[PDB]
Ligand binder design. Structure first.
Ligand code: NA
Ligand code: NA
Ligand code: NA
Ligand code: NA
Ligand code: NA
Ligand code: NA
Ligand code: NA
Ligand code: NA
Ligand code: NA
Ligand code: NA
Ligand code: NA
Ligand code: NA
Ligand code: NA
Ligand code: NA
Lengths: 220, 220
């Protein structure tokens, strides 16, 4: 079948000159541009890093101009089958996208990290472990692990994962952080956590700070 | 008390040179920039029109980088009181914003139209009727009327309203269009409708087309 080509923005290290690559994965109803803005405070501390943020391949069922990786039944009326098929198709697309970025940036998988937010975190946690080669790592903000029971079997690679979550998150339950964390840890992933105390569904400065330290240490 | 100043983008007629003003009001979790993009196809057909799109004054409870006019309890866990207070505060802010735009553009209220999407439509339908002077009109996409029972008493002005809604809208029930429509019509508002057949929660070309005709006719 066919992959949908993802549009994306870029920041950071001059083309041709990237030592490493961070791919931002936005949340439901958003777009690449929002998260890519995090490249501003991060870039000076990650000199040779290129930042990219694709737009999810489908229009968002719940808003006018945003994108979704896949639909969310409890929210937008989609069926569970549509949600599942959507995730598989989005994973197909993102996998192809990562290959393309690594190919064009001239980098190996160990110099790529994924940084997700919410639905984007679900995408990162699904796609990365299923890659043939282990990437540098995953930072997952405010998200969850969609199919924990499958992780065991299907994980082909096991990059380190930092999960960051607000303990007052009103849309993705804080408990999902521990649930995702233990599924990962038990499957052999080196897993880290940071709790954004008093934070809702968003990225607070302390969350960005810990993500930076994690990336700075993992990226070549 | 105090109003929050709204950031906004602008398009269209050269500053100083505007014959009319269209204010876009974005939906929950979005921002001004998205809707303001509609200025591109509209501008050539509305020569002297200035387009502006404010960002809603609060961070969105449900996403990372978007804005809300007020929270949505069924979706983000907020209380009904928080939702009600949020709407009152947002209305205070938008009212002040409109005054400022009219003041700076050097225009009278009859050369201002509001174009809403979803939550933004709820804002338009709340604020416009409560203005002292009647504006040119309101185009409400894919939204609803929050307090129909109060409309009677509190409407101080009654500009014409065009409601546009997708009959397959999975997040704002198509029925809300008729409900909003009859509340308005019975309160003395000249009310129009266009159904976007087969459309979900978004703006299809036929919806944009009818909005343009409506604006072109109402704006000086
Ligand atoms: Na895309
Ligand atoms: Na995002
Ligand atoms: Na999401
Ligand atoms: Na984008
Ligand atoms: Na839709
Ligand atoms: Na997470
Ligand atoms: Na989880
Ligand atoms: Na604002
Ligand atoms: Na919008
Ligand atoms: Na909305
Ligand atoms: Na904006
Ligand atoms: Na929140
Ligand atoms: Na509407
Ligand atoms: Na309604």
């Amino acid at each position: 079948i066919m992959t949908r080509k993802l549009t994306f923005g870029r920041r950071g290290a001059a083309p041709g000159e990237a030592t490493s690559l961070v791919v931002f994965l936005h949340g439901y109803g958003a777009d690449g541009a929002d998260l890519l803005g995090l490249a501003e405070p991060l870039a000076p501390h990650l000199p040779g890093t290129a930042f990219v943020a694709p737009d999810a391949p489908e229009p968002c069922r719940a808003n006018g101009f945003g994108f979704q990786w896949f639909p969310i039944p409890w929210l937008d009326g989609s069926s569970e089958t549509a949600a599942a098929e959507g995730m598989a198709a989005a994973a197909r697309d993102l996998d192809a996208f990562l290959d393309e970025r690594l190919a064009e940036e001239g980098l190996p998988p160990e110099a790529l990290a994924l940084v997700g937010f919410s639905q984007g975190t679900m995408m990162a946690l699904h796609v990365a472990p299923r890659r043939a080669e282990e990437i540098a790592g995953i930072v997952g903000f405010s998200g969850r692990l969609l199919a924990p029971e499958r992780l065991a079997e299907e994980a082909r690679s096991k990059p380190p994962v930092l999960l960051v979550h607000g303990d007052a998150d009103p849309v993705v339950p804080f408990a999902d952080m521990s649930l995702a964390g233990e599924a990962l840890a038990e499957a052999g992933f080196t897993t880290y956590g940071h709790v954004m105390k008093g934070t809702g569904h968003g990225i607070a400065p302390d969350g960005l700070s810990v993500a930076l330290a994690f990336l700075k240490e993992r990226l070549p």
